[PDB]
Amino acid sequence: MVLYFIGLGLYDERDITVKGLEIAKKCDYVFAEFYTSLMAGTTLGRIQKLIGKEIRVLSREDVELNFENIVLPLAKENDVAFLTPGDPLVATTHAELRIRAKRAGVESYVIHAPSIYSAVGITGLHIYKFGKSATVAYPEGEWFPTSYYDVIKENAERGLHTLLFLDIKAEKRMYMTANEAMELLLKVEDMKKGGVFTDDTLVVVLARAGSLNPTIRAGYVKDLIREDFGDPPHILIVPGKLHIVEAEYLVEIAGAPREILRVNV
Amino acid sequence: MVLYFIGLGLYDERDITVKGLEIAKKCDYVFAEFYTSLMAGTTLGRIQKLIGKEIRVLSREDVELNFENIVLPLAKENDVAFLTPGDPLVATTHAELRIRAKRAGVESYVIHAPSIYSAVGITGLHIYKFGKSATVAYPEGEWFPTSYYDVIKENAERGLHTLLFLDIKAEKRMYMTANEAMELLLKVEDMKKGGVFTDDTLVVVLARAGSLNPTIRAGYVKDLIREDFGDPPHILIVPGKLHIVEAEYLVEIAGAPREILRVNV
Numbered sequence: 001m002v003l004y005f006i007g008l009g010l011y012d013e014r015d016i017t018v019k020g021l022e023i024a025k026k027c028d029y030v031f032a033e034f035y036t037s038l039m040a041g042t043t044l045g046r047i048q049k050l051i052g053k054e055i056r057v058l059s060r061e062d063v064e065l066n067f068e069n070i071v072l073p074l075a076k077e078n079d080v081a082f083l084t085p086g087d088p089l090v091a092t093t094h095a096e097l098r099i100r101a102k103r104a105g106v107e108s109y110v111i112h113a114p115s116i117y118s119a120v121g122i123t124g125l126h127i128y129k130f131g132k133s134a135t136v137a138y139p140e141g142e143w144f145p146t147s148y149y150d151v152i153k154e155n156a157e158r159g160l161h162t163l164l165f166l167d168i169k170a171e172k173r174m175y176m177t178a179n180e181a182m183e184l185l186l187k188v189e190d191m192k193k194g195g196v197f198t199d200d201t202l203v204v205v206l207a208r209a210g211s212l213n214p215t216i217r218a219g220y221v222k223d224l225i226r227e228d229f230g231d232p233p234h235i236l237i238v239p240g241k242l243h244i245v246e247a248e249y250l251v252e253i254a255g256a257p258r259e260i261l262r263v264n265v
Numbered sequence: 266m267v268l269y270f271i272g273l274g275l276y277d278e279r280d281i282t283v284k285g286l287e288i289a290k291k292c293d294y295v296f297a298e299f300y301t302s303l304m305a306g307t308t309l310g311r312i313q314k315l316i317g318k319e320i321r322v323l324s325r326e327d328v329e330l331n332f333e334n335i336v337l338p339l340a341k342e343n344d345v346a347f348l349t350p351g352d353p354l355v356a357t358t359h360a361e362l363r364i365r366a367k368r369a370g371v372e373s374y375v376i377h378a379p380s381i382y383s384a385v386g387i388t389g390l391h392i393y394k395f396g397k398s399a400t401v402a403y404p405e406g407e408w409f410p411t412s413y414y415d416v417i418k419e420n421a422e423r424g425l426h427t428l429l430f431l432d433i434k435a436e437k438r439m440y441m442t443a444n445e446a447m448e449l450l451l452k453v454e455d456m457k458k459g460g461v462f463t464d465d466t467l468v469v470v471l472a473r474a475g476s477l478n479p480t481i482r483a484g485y486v487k488d489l490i491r492e493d494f495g496d497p498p499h500i501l502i503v504p505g506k507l508h509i510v511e512a513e514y515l516v517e518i519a520g521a522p523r524e525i526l527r528v529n530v
């Protein structure tokens with residue numbers, strides 16, 4: 001009679017909360033989805049071993065089209081868990097699944113976990129200064145999406161930071177790198193000429209948040225565009241005007257050039 | 266030797282991540298602060314029992330003025346952990362403490378935990394649509410803080426949602442309720458008259474996120490301003506223009522007036 005939406009956290013199998021783990025262990029059936037994002041620091045096998053339960057992974061179609069036929073039926077007479085990377089309901093489509101549960105007469109509860117949306121706090125940038133967020137999508141064919149460029153423009157204009165989620169091919173396990181994202185942004189700039197993203201733009205790269213050894217780097221595009229930030233996943237942030245304390249953290253912790261203390265504050 | 270900044274999560278002792286718990290259990294000394302937020306579903310005793318270590322609680326003064334005298338010295342010859350509610354670097358000034366750690370020759374690591382900043386996804390509002398955040402501070406003496414009003418104004422004009430962290434005076438055991446925040450906002454509106462926060466404004470209240478049954482309510486200020494949302498902590502959200510799916514969730518899950526389904530495109 002109960003469905004639990006449980007977040008797996010940021011990077012590996014230990015990023016689930018104690019609450020999430022204990023609840024998952026007591027569930028009769030455990031499902032999971034790895035299409036909104038992936039858990040790069042672990043494997044389904046390691047997650048299954050930790051939870052001590054077999055996990056049925058669902059595709060995007062299984063969820064969007066058949067959630068009420070695959071998951072909810074079992075939730076009617078059993079305790080069922082639905083695992084998702086990060087924090088449940090951060091992904092935009094997740095929320096509506098609770099409505100489906102309600103329609104099916106199934107109670108649902110949410111067990112939170114760390115999300116990249118909040119983990120960016122480790123960049124030293126003040127959380128309240130982050131504005132609207134966006135996703136940098138790979139262009140393909142004659143389709144060249146550029147809405148994320150306008151998001152940066154509008155946030156930066158108001159002195160706000162922009163969190164950019166990077167594209168991912170869940171099935172093919174292909175992750176867009178911060179390097180690729182920077183190249184794309186320079187390409188959009190060359191097309192729009194808005195003076196929003198150039199070689200002189202200060203950026204912050206956060207790779208493998210959740211890991212004990214994430215890569216946190218800050219610097220100008222001209223210097224970071226070909227830098228190796230390590231294995232995925234990567235997150236790109238375009239800061240707005242910096243508070244001196246934010247800048248000092250970027251210099252001391254993220255190896256940012258001293259120049260940012262006079263140019264971006 | 267090492268210093269770990271470990272988040273404890275949203276509501277109770279089990280909101281810590283498995284990673285955080287396994288590391289905390291092996292540390293030589295464990296410190297913590299409980300003034301940046303309120304964990305309404307646990308006690309110091311329960312946290313100590315879970316980690317199996319005595320926790321020395323520090324006051325705001327101990328941390329801001331003496332972190333380098335109380336915590337860092339021990340981290341030079343031992344494994345030390347510093348615990349905080351929610352995520353340690355979200356809506357706190359703790360990031361700067363990593364700079365102090367470095368200057369003292371102490372390596373630091375960060376272990377994330379669920380944060381209210383991302384938990385608001387449970388309201389059904391799209392996380393990417395949240396703009397700049399703000400804090401509603403208690404007026405004191407003859408000074409009445411009003412910056413948060415301008416934040417809502419700026420976000421709303423852009424169709425973005427506004428997360429409003431509410432004030433806390435941990436030593437006085439004072440936790441601002443959503444009701445008190447609404448009363449303050451109405452007073453600022455009477456002054457600035459920007460049509461930003463009125464009795465007809467739609468708002469969302471999230472209380473005790475992290476618990477299994479948090480209070481999630483949406484409706485007009487005139488109807489919610491005197492409603493009992495239960496024990497603290499509370500956060501107030503002023504949505505911008507809603508997507509149909511957001512409206513549907515607010516109606517189905519947060520009890521919002523069915524009339525909000527009819528969005529004005």
Ligand SMILES: Nc1ncnc2c1ncn2[C@@H]1O[C@H](CSCC[C@H](N)C(=O)O)[C@@H](O)[C@H]1O
Pocket residue numbers: 275276301302303350351352353354355356357379380381382429430431432433471472473474475498499500
């Ligand atoms: N479980 C919870 N439910 C509702 N609001 C919460 C909350 N935890 C924190 N808050 C809100 O956030 C304020 C503290 S701000 C510190 C936040 C913390 N670092 C985190 O990551 O969550 C509180 O005064 C309250 O308004």
